[PDB]
Design an enzyme around this catalytic site. Structure first.
Site, PDB file in Angstrom:
ATOM      1  CB  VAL A  60     -52.292 -25.969  82.448  1.00 22.36           C
ATOM      2  CG1 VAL A  60     -52.956 -27.042  83.275  1.00 22.36           C
ATOM      3  CG2 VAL A  60     -51.306 -25.185  83.294  1.00 22.36           C
ATOM      4  CG  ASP A  61     -51.656 -31.586  80.279  1.00 17.85           C
ATOM      5  OD1 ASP A  61     -52.374 -32.365  80.940  1.00 17.85           O
ATOM      6  OD2 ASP A  61     -50.457 -31.370  80.553  1.00 17.85           O
ATOM      7  N   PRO A  62     -55.270 -30.687  79.838  1.00 14.01           N
ATOM      8  CG  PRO A  62     -57.036 -31.219  78.401  1.00 14.01           C
ATOM      9  CD  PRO A  62     -55.573 -30.867  78.405  1.00 14.01           C
TER      10      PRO A  62
END
Ligand SMILES: CCCCCCCCCCCCCCCCCC(=O)OC[C@H](COP(=O)([O-])OCC(O)COP(=O)([O-])OC[C@@H](COC(=O)CCCCCCCCCCCCCCCCC)OC(=O)CCCCCCCCCCCCCCCCC)OC(=O)CCCCCCCCCCCCCCCCC
Ligand SMILES: CCCCCCCCCCCCCCCCCC(=O)OC[C@H](COP(=O)([O-])OCC(O)COP(=O)([O-])OC[C@@H](COC(=O)CCCCCCCCCCCCCCCCC)OC(=O)CCCCCCCCCCCCCCCCC)OC(=O)CCCCCCCCCCCCCCCCC
Ligand SMILES: CCCCCCCCCCCCCCCCCC(=O)OC[C@H](COP(=O)([O-])OCC(O)COP(=O)([O-])OC[C@@H](COC(=O)CCCCCCCCCCCCCCCCC)OC(=O)CCCCCCCCCCCCCCCCC)OC(=O)CCCCCCCCCCCCCCCCC
Ligand SMILES: CCCCCCCCCCCCCCCCCC(=O)OC[C@H](COP(=O)([O-])OCC(O)COP(=O)([O-])OC[C@@H](COC(=O)CCCCCCCCCCCCCCCCC)OC(=O)CCCCCCCCCCCCCCCCC)OC(=O)CCCCCCCCCCCCCCCCC
Ligand SMILES: CCCCC/C=C/C/C=C/C/C=C\C/C=C\CCCC(=O)O[C@H](COC(=O)CCCCCCCCCCCCCCCCC)COP(=O)(O)O[C@@H]1[C@H](O)[C@H](O)[C@@H](O)[C@H](O)[C@H]1O
Ligand SMILES: CCCCCCCCCCCCCCCCCC(=O)OC[C@H](COP(=O)([O-])OCC[N+](C)(C)C)OC(=O)CCCCCCCCCCCCCCCCC
Ligand SMILES: CCCCCCCCCCCCCCCCCC(=O)OC[C@H](COP(=O)([O-])OCC[N+](C)(C)C)OC(=O)CCCCCCCCCCCCCCCCC
Lengths: 63, 168, 54, 62, 96, 97, 709, 70, 98, 62
Positions: free
Chosen positions: I53-55
């Site tokens: 999960v990226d920002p």
């Protein structure tokens, strides 16, 4: 002074009585008969009312 | 107190006319109102150990009797018709309106609106809110002495309207 | 409503409580401020009744 | 003076529970005195004042 | 500071001596000494702290007798002010 | 004091009576309303008795007695006020003194 | 033993009384046998069977004696009984049987018993002496005592006591409401002299129950009853439901006192009371200072109103030395040709008094400029907002205008300020309500618009239209407030409908009742709101200098009801599910499926249903009393009669065509709101097809219904 | 709102239910009704009503409004 | 009713919502994202980078979690979350979680 | 605030009113009402308060 204020209060009470005993269909005629003239007679200069001082000359106070 | 005292002192500027009656009645009314208000301030200062608005608020939730007394003091101070402050205001303001209508309106506007708004703002903010800080040091309710003194002030301010009108 | 707890089974539905005033019910002092103010109230009421009511 | 002193000296002996216990642990004449004495003196003083302000003694009556 | 006498003589303080029991045996070498006085106040069973517990009739009787005295005094005052010994009751009374 | 109204004739009054109209007159207070009546004082005595019995019952059950006590105190207070109102010479709209 | 002896003694006493009375009346055996000449057989004869009469007389000899002593102790009179020695008085009174003259024991008992019979209450006694005062006092004192005794009475105790008091008040007021509205009844009740106000002057606490007073008080009391029954449901599991109930009751009784004033002092008392009770109602969440600022803004506006009202009353008193409203109204015409020298100006006497009264009315009955406190006063609970906005606080200015009608008939300032400000306020309120996303703010701005319309209706010169508009708006605004309050409670204190939608299934009764109350409130055609708006446009005077602006504002505010009514109803109930998942899913679990399932309260549903039914009945009764060919309304105490009823009775074709213009504007707005597609949908093409076929069907229906058959 | 504990010493009305509220309601309603009945009688002594239907005020009767004789 | 005796605040388990239910709902919501390849690799101890999960995906997932749990999460608290366990603990201990 | 009970109706209150520390004197607790409107100590009427101890010791020494 209190007696003239009593006169005004009595005329106001009689106006209140007329407002109840007489419907609006004929109240103003009977009021303009005699009551309105006495109401204007017992007015701001002629009676002290709620005013601080009834400004009377010495002759008026004597009367 | 300064405002009420100046209003009463105004009534004595027409000599011995029918203006001293309102002055006497307002003197009694201001005596009882100032006694009640300073007694409420005394109760607040003895309970919360402060008088400033920034240090005490939310009195109604921790000391309900004190908050109720404050609110009813404001109601009485607002010149409610049932009490004797309304009578004194009626006397003085009727006389002043017949003397000077514009100055009467100015006096009634500044005293009964702006001054009343500020007075209620400083008391409503104390009565309401949350007394969150210093829960360990929160005081108790009003005692019987303070309650009865406040009730006697209210009772006089109410029942003195039925005093004989011969002298008023 | 959906899940209602009645008064008897509610653990936080308070019955009337609290001390009416700050006076200690078990106070052992001969404190007379309350009595003096009650006397003031009663005598004022009687003076109004016995001298001024009619 | 008598009514004021009796009312305070009898109703200021302690808290509510303490006063209730003290008044319960009294003979009936003592409780009557605790109740009757403060009222009778003040009432009689007010009655004397009322007779003072009134003119029932005027003889021109029918 | 308060300096009155707690040990009153007009009555005995209502107390419950069984709520707290002072320890008297089995002390350890580091435990504190027990407390001599452990009596707690005992309120009446029918006591409500949120209202006046006044169950007498003295105040009501005093106010009622004052009001009745006011009534009879007004009756006599009206009789005297009208120049009579007792009030003359009219056969009909009307609204003011 | 004067009549303050335009006078009408007795012939006109007779004509109005012929047409079914009736002259307005004040009516005396009923015995319940009249504060000088046996009905009024019997009601007061009944109020006093039931108020004392209800004070006893309220003390038994813990219900407030302050309002029944107020009723007892105000039974003579109401009589005083009513008789003072009836005795004063002032009138507002009611029957003329 | 005791009972048998008592019965025997009573029978003997009654027999002796009958023997004495039957032998005393004709003045022959009045004395001769009574105190017969010794003859000790005779003495025992008179002291043995008249003994119950003598013994009781002996009690009458000792009971009175001591009683007199009591007076001698309490009053210092009569010198006690020095003339007697207690041996002559007792013997004289005991042997004197003249006291038992025309007295029977059983007759006295019967008279005691028949002094409490309720079958002889009669209806003329109710007509002659208003029992409504007794029930109003009961409601007021029960409210006050519940405020003082919140611990003796719990939640249920407070609710039941106040419910009984309010129901007795409402039942009493309905009968007198019918009598006053129809049969020209009114009452002036003087509750004793109240307080001195000038040297030798004492005003009395007087009440005037007449057509204006009964109208305002009945509207307030009905709305208050059906809000009070609803209030217990809305505050279901809240800490201070008794506190909310008592605040509502105090505000209601303050408004009832205000509208029933007989003097200007009772009027000012009611004004201050409604101000302070509204402040307490608005500031119900005392723990929040965010509520305190709104309540304090309302308080400041109320204090300005109090200043204006007090100054107007002071001018009236300094002019007429009178505070009775009837006397002032019937004599203010004498002072029309008067001026007051205020500073450097000579202002007309009627003009200045009317200016102050109108400012006071505008601040309370929210008009443009002074309205800003009303939208902020929505921090109050929903029942409080319903009482404040439907009637009472915002109807106080209308009461001021109606009660002092003869004063404002002779004012040029009134003639210029009432229609202009009323129309501007109506336009502003309706337009802003048409754009509001909050339900409570929407209804508050609708209330502002309808207050402006009420001001305009008063400016038309017809007071019957003002009464009708006030009643209709109050009833339906109160009902809509209750409905949106249930919606807000279901949405968990989120009032904006941008987080609503699909609530028809969860709130079916709310949906249907809200539909009915909104179509009535917004003045949609074929409804009572349409009737009141049509009456408003019937009497609108066209002689004003600013008539273009006034009429344009009135039209744009009258067409604005459709928008806010439709937006509120559709967005709340039939839009998409814009709300949060927790709101919907938690109320739709299969376990909750039961015959008891409801997202509202049965009490709330019954209260709203009965409120709507009673509103319909009362509005129909008022319409029959005013709008019928036979005008049966009581006197409104106004001598200014215009010809606005002529266009209601016998209109011309131009007026019909103008109202047709207005109706077609409303129709076009309905077409816009129903058929405009602001978003993409699968039904977009079919919606346009439906619009086309509806237009064609309407055209052909008009063709067939007018010409063919 | 979720119920939370209330101090025992505080004389507040939050979630206060009196188990004997029925007798309290009785003894707070009925005496209040009696007091209001007495006040109602007193105020009905001073009460004014216009003439009924079919009744007119005779201008020369004492009931009619009067003017001051100077 | 109240026991007529002094009763203090009951902290109980310290969770205003069921921690396991909150964790399962949060993991289901995370798995709904297009960039979360393996729902079965998600653990309370797992990190957002570990679960891929990226920002920005974290921002989207947390906004939808706020919509689901009937609460709003401050950005400081959201940046304070280092693991799914931390997020679940914060949500469950929230008084307004629904 | 929940545990606060200075009059001992809900939480039992010691007659000693406090447990003294092992490093502090046995001072009384400050009352909630610090009123100083107190009479002198009130003893019941006909209270026998003679110094019986001293009288007995003097009798023994006599
Ligand atoms: C020979 C005969 C000669 C005489 C003949 C008659 C002559 C008559 C003359 C006129 C007489 C006038 C009346 C009597 C005056 C003297 C009274 C007196 O001394 O009585 C003593 C005594 C009564 O005392 P007691 O019963 O022994 O106990 C007294 C203790 O203090 C009790 O202690 P306690 O603490 O246990 O009890 C306290 C209790 C007992 O009550 C009292 O002690 C009352 C004391 C005064 C309290 C006043 C509180 C405030 C009231 C409202 C004020 C106005 C507010 C609103 C204003 C607007 O208090 C209450 O019940 C309080 C009521 C609740 C008040 C709540 C108020 C809330 C706020 C409301 C307003 C909010 C506004 C905002 O009298 C008798 O016993 C009568 C004997 C009769 C013998 C007859 C022989 C023949
Ligand atoms: C905490 C303390 C308060 C803190 C306050 C802080 C300030 C903020 C506000 C807080 C508000 C909430 C506080 C709550 C405190 C509390 O625990 O409350 C519960 C507590 C309940 O008591 P409780 O817990 O059951 O224990 C008390 C015992 O049961 C009682 O047992 P009892 O059966 O023996 O009853 C004894 C009762 C027996 O006597 C009575 O019941 C009547 C008392 C008054 C007698 C007349 C005095 C007249 C003086 C002026 C002259 C006027 C002449 C013209 C009159 C017309 O006498 C008294 O209580 C002593 C009264 C002494 C009065 C002395 C004169 C001062 C002025 C009094 C004005 C009262 C106005 C009442 C109406 C307006 C209320 C806002 O108090 C209340 O609920 C207060 C009720 C107040 C109204 C009473 C009922 C109506 C009175 C009618 C009077 C006559 C009407 C005649 C009508 C027809 C003719 C016009
Ligand atoms: C020496 C100096 C020593 C100083 C010591 C300190 C103590 C003070 C001493 C100085 C004061 C002395 C006072 C004095 O001499 O009084 C004797 C003086 C002697 O009178 P009088 O000239 O011999 O009387 C001749 C006749 O008896 C005829 O009497 P009247 O013509 O005066 O008639 C009496 C009348 C005179 O009283 C009144 O007219 C009362 C008017 C005011 C009521 C309250 C207004 C204010 C409320 C707010 C207060 C502030 C708080 C705000 C909170 C928010 O009172 C009543 O009839 C009582 C009515 C009570 C129930 C009504 C309550 C309000 C109802 C509202 C309207 C209905 C609502 C429902 C809606 C409508 C229906 C659908 O006594 C009075 O005037 C009686 C005062 C009674 C006051 C009300 C008491 C109620 C509770 C019991
Ligand atoms: C005696 C009984 C009298 C009648 C009593 C019941 C009245 C109707 C009650 C059920 C419907 C209420 C809906 C209310 C909400 C609404 O309009 O949502 C828009 C809602 C949103 O649309 P959508 O479902 O998303 O789809 C887009 C299209 O609407 C998709 O279009 P569509 O294919 O679904 O619809 C095509 C067709 C399908 O037809 C139907 O389904 C028939 C259903 C109703 C039959 C009875 C009325 C027939 C028309 C008259 O409907 C029409 O052609 C109706 C066009 C109406 C235009 C205006 C005509 C009257 C102008 C002159 C004023 C007359 C007095 C009005 C006020 C009366 C007192 C309130 O659309 C509709 O509700 C369309 C049906 C409207 C039926 C006629 C309603 C006439 C009265 C006006 C009600 C609304 C006034 C605004 C304020 C409301 C405050 C509460
Ligand atoms: C409808 C609701 C259903 C009623 C069923 C009842 C018929 C009669 C009643 C049965 C009792 C239930 C009524 C109620 O809750 O409080 C009343 C008192 O309250 C009023 O006296 C004071 C008046 C309160 C009465 C509330 C009714 C409101 C309507 C007022 C008149 C309008 C009527 C028209 C209605 C429709 C118009 C819109 C309760 O009396 P209570 O003190 O003797 O109850 C005692 C009982 O006597 C003892 O035996 C028990 O030991 C004790 O525990 C306790 O239960
Ligand atoms: C003729 C005589 C007429 C006399 C009228 C007297 C009117 C004022 C007294 C009202 C009752 C006593 C005060 C009750 C306070 C209370 O319960 O507050 C709740 C609560 C009490 O807080 P609480 O719930 O924490 O405490 C409950 C326990 N006690 C009260 C014992 C501590 O207070 C508030 O919410 C504060 C806001 C103000 C509350 C009162 C608002 C209305 C008061 C005026 C009503 C006026 C009606 C019309 C009067 C004129 C009629 C002509
Ligand atoms: C059932 C509930 C119905 C609710 C909606 C009613 C809508 C019509 C309101 C009519 C108001 C005017 C009015 O009183 O008209 C009198 C008329 C009859 O009196 P009219 O015909 O002499 O007066 C009409 C006068 N002009 C023509 C000038 C307007 O009543 C009606 O038209 C019927 C109204 C409905 C009556 C329902 C009774 C149940």
């Amino acid at each position: 002074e209190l007696f003239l204020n009593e006169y005004r209060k009595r005329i106001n009470n009689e106006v209140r009585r007329a407002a109840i005993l007489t419907p609006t269909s004929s109240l103003r005629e009977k009021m303009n008969h005699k009551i309105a003239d006495q109401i204007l007679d017992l007015s701001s200069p002629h009676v002290r009312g709620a005013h601080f001082q009834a400004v009377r000359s010495w002759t008026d106070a004597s009367k | 107190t300064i405002q009420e005292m100046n209003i009463i002192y105004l009534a004595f500027c027409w000599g011995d006319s029918c203006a001293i009656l309102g002055g006497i009645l307002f003197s009694a009314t201001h005596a009882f109102l100032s006694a009640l208000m300073f007694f409420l301030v005394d109760c607040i200062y003895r309970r919360y150990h402060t008088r400033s608005l920034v240090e005490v608020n939310g009195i109604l939730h921790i000391t309900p009797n004190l908050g109720l007394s404050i609110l009813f003091m404001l109601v009485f101070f607002s010149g409610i018709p049932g009490t004797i402050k309304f009578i004194s205001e009626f006397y003085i303001f009727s006389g002043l309106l017949e003397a000077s209508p514009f100055i009467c309106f100015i006096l009634m506007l500044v005293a009964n609106v702006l001054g009343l708004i500020g007075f209620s703002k400083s008391w409503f903010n104390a009565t309401f809110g949350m007394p969150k800080k210093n829960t360990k040091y929160l005081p108790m309710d009003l005692s019987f002495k303070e309650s009865y003194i406040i009730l006697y002030c209210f009772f006089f301010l109410f029942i003195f309207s039925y005093f004989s009108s011969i002298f008023f | 409503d959906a899940y209602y707890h009645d008064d008897t089974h509610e653990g936080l539905m308070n019955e009337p409580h609290g001390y009416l005033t700050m006076d200690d019910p078990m106070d052992l002092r001969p404190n007379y401020e309350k009595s003096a103010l009650e006397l003031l109230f009663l005598v004022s009421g009687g003076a109004i009744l016995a001298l001024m009511l009619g | 003076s008598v009514g004021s002193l009796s009312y305070i000296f009898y109703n200021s002996v302690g808290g509510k529970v303490i006063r209730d216990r003290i008044r319960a642990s009294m003979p009936f004449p003592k409780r009557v005195l605790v109740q009757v004495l403060p009222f009778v003196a003040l009432g009689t003083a007010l009655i004397i004042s009322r007779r003072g302000i009134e003119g029932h003694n005027h003889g021109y009556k029918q | 500071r308060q300096n009155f006498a707690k040990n009153i003589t007009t009555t005995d303080i209502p107390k419950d001596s069984h709520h707290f029991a002072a320890k008297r045996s089995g002390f350890t070498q580091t435990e504190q000494a027990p407390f001599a006085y452990n009596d707690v106040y005992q309120y009446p069973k029918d006591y409500k702290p949120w209202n006046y517990n006044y169950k007498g009739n003295g105040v009501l009787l005093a106010l009622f007798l004052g009001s009745a005295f006011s009534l009879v005094a007004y009756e006599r005052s009206y009789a005297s002010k009208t120049g009579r010994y007792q009030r003359k009751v009219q056969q009909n009374y009307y609204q003011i | 004091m004067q009549n303050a109204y335009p006078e009408i004739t007795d012939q006109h009054r007779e004509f109005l009576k012929k047409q079914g109209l009736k002259v307005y007159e004040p009516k005396p207070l009923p015995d319940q309303i009249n504060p000088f009546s046996k009905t009024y004082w019997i009601t007061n005595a009944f109020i006093i008795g039931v108020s004392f019995l209800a004070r006893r019952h309220a003390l038994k059950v813990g219900a407030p007695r302050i309002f029944w006590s107020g009723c007892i105190v105000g039974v003579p207070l109401a009589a005083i006020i009513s008789r003072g109102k009836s005795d004063q010479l002032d009138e507002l709209v009611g029957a003329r003194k | 033993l005791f009972l048998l002896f008592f019965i025997v003694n009573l029978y003997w006493f009654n027999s002796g009384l009958i023997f004495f009375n039957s032998v005393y009346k004709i003045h022959h055996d009045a004395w001769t046998l009574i105190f017969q000449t010794d003859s000790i057989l005779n003495k025992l004869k008179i002291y043995f069977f008249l003994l119950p009469l003598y013994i009781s007389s002996f009690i009458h000899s000792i009971s009175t004696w001591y009683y007199n002593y009591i007076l001698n102790f309490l009053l210092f009179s009569e010198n006690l009984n020095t003339n007697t020695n207690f041996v002559d008085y007792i013997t004289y009174n005991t042997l004197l049987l003249s006291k038992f003259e025309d007295f029977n024991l059983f007759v006295y008992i019967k008279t005691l018993l028949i002094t409490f019979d309720i079958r002889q209450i009669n209806l003329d006694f109710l007509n002659e002496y208003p029992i409504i005062l007794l029930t109003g006092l009961l409601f007021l004192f029960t409210t006050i005592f519940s405020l003082i005794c919140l611990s003796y009475l719990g939640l249920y105790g407070v609710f039941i006591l106040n419910l009984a008091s309010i129901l007795l008040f409402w039942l009493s007021m309905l009968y007198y409401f019918n009598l006053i509205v129809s049969e020209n009844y009114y009452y002036y009740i003087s509750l004793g002299k109240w307080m001195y106000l000038s040297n030798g002057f004492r005003v009395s606490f007087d009440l005037l129950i007449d057509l204006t007073s009964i109208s305002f008080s009945f509207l307030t009391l009905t709305i208050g009853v059906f809000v009070y029954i609803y209030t217990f449901s809305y505050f279901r599991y809240e800490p201070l439901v008794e506190r909310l109930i008592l605040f509502l009751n105090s505000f209601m009784i303050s408004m009832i006192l205000l509208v029933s004033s007989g003097n200007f002092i009772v009027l000012f008392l009611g004004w201050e009371l409604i101000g302070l009770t509204s402040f307490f109602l608005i500031n119900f969440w005392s723990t929040r200072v965010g509520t305190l600022k709104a309540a304090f803004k309302a308080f400041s506006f109320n204090k300005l109103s109090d200043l204006f009202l007090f100054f107007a009353i002071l001018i009236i008193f300094s002019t007429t030395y009178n505070l009775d409203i009837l006397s002032f109204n019937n004599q203010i015409y004498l002072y029309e040709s008067y001026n007051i020298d205020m500073f450097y100006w000579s202002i007309n006497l009627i003009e200045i008094i009317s200016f102050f009264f109108i400012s006071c009315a505008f601040i309370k009955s929210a008009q443009f400029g002074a309205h800003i406190w009303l939208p902020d006063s929505m921090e109050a609970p929903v029942p409080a907002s319903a009482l404040i906005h439907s009637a009472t606080l915002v109807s106080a200015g209308i009461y001021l205008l109606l009660r002092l009608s003869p004063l404002f008939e002779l004012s040029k300032y009134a003639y210029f300020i009432l229609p202009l400000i009323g129309s501007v306020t109506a336009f502003y309120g309706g337009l802003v309500s048409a754009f509001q996303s909050d339900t409570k703010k929407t209804l508050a701005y609708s209330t502002i618009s309808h207050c402006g319309f009420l001001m305009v209706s008063y400016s038309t010169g017809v007071l019957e239209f003002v009464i009708l508009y006030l009643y209709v708006h109050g009833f339906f605004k109160a009902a809509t407030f209750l409905c949106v309050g249930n919606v807000n409670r279901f949405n968990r204190n989120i009032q904006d409908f941008k987080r609503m939608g699909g609530f028809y299934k969860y709130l079916p009764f709310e949906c249907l009742a809200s539909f009915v109350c909104m179509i009535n409130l917004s003045g949609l055609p074929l409804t009572l709101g349409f009737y009141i708006k049509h009456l408003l446009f019937i009497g609108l005077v066209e002689s004003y200098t600013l008539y273009p602006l006034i009429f344009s504002s009135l039209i744009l505010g009258a067409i604005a009801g459709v928008f806010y009514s439709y937006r509120l109803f559709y967005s709340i109930f039939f839009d998409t599910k814009k709300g949060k998942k927790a709101i919907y899913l938690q109320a739709s679990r299969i376990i909750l499926n039961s015959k008891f399932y409801s997202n509202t309260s049965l009490a709330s549903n019954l209260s709203i249903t009965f409120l709507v039914l009673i509103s319909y009945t009362v509005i129909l009764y008022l319409y029959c009393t005013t709008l019928n060919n036979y005008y049966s309304l009581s006197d409104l105490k106004s001598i200014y009669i215009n010809n606005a009823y002529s266009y209601f009775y016998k209109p011309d074709y131009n007026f019909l065509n103008a109202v047709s213009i207005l109706n077609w504007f409303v129709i076009i707005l309905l077409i816009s709101v129903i058929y405009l597609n602001w978003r993409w949908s699968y039904y977009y093409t079919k919606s346009i097809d439906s619009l086309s076929k509806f237009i064609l069907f309407s055209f052909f229906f008009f063709i067939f219904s007018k010409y063919i058959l | 709102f979720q119920k939370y504990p209330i101090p025992r010493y505080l004389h507040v009305g939050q979630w206060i239910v009196n188990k004997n509220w029925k007798w309290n309601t009785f003894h707070m309603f009925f005496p209040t009704a009696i007091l209001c009945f007495m006040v109602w009688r007193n105020s009905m002594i001073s009460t004014a009503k216009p003439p009924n239907y079919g009744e007119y005020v005779d201008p020369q009767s004492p009931v009619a409004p009067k003017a001051i004789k100077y | 009713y109240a026991p007529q005796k002094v009763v203090l605040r009951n902290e109980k388990s310290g969770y205003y919502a069921n921690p396991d239910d909150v964790a399962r709902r949060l993991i289901r919501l995370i798995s709904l994202h297009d960039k979360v390849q393996n729902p079965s690799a998600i653990t309370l101890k797992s990190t957002w980078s570990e679960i891929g999960v990226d920002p920005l995906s974290y921002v989207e997932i947390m906004l939808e979690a706020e919509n689901e749990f009937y609460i709003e999460l401050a950005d400081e608290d959201l940046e304070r979350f280092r693991t799914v366990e931390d997020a679940v603990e914060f949500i469950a201990r929230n008084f307004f979680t629904n | 605030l929940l545990k606060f009970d200075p009059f001992g109706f809900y939480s039992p209150k010691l007659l000693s009113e406090n447990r003294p520390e092992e490093a502090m004197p046995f001072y009384e607790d400050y009352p909630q009402n610090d009123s100083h409107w107190n009479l002198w100590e009130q003893f019941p009427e006909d209270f026998e308060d003679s110094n019986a101890e001293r009288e007995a010791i003097l009798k023994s020494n006599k």
